[PDB]
Amino acid sequence: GNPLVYLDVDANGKPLGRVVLELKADVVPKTAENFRALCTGEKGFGYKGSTFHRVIPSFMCQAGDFTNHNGTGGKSIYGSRFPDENFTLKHVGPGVLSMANAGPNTNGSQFFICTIKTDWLDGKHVVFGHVIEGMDVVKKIESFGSKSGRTSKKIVITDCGQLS
């Protein structure tokens, strides 16, 4: 069974609802497990309390920098960084869940949820899941973004975890 995880998201303290994500452990098990564990917080750190720090309408919503909150930080469950597992899955459309990075083999904790097909990221960012519920919440997040990526409200992952 591919793991299912959830993000409960707020904007300036107001709940937006829940996003449920299927993690494709059947294709990218190491990357899926990193994200699963960062949702549960079982290593003592993870996504709870962190923000969507870069949100660009008609592109993607990026989150997961729980150390620096600005797109420079984070860490994986495997040490600071881990290599690109594979590029099997493509950025096919809205709801794709993929690893942010700073170049090859720089996966940590930062991730993004696409709101469009982002084919120019294929082969550069490791796709590892998909939204199965709460795409409307993703669109709410997107609506607080801007062309620069700066957000107009503080978008926080209030809670997160695994659904079992």
Ligand SMILES: NCCOCCNC(=O)[C@@H]1CCNC(=O)/C=C/C(=O)N2CCC[C@](Cc3ccccc3)(C2)C(=O)N[C@@H](Cc2ccc(-c3ccccc3)cc2)C(=O)NCc2ccccc2CC(=O)N1
């Ligand atoms: N129809 C047209 C629609 O088209 C719109 C098109 N725009 C597009 O395609 C654009 C075009 C190209 N600009 C960009 O690369 C934008 C960059 C940007 O904002 N920086 C602000 C944040 C910092 C920087 C630079 C920096 C500084 C310190 C350390 C590392 C890098 C730059 C960054 O690079 N930080 C990573 C994120 C990350 C992830 C993991 C780590 C890590 C840390 C610790 C341990 C392990 C890992 C560090 C940083 C970033 O943010 N990566 C960019 C990115 C993130 C997510 C998805 C996709 C993209 C590509 C994109 O954004 N591509």
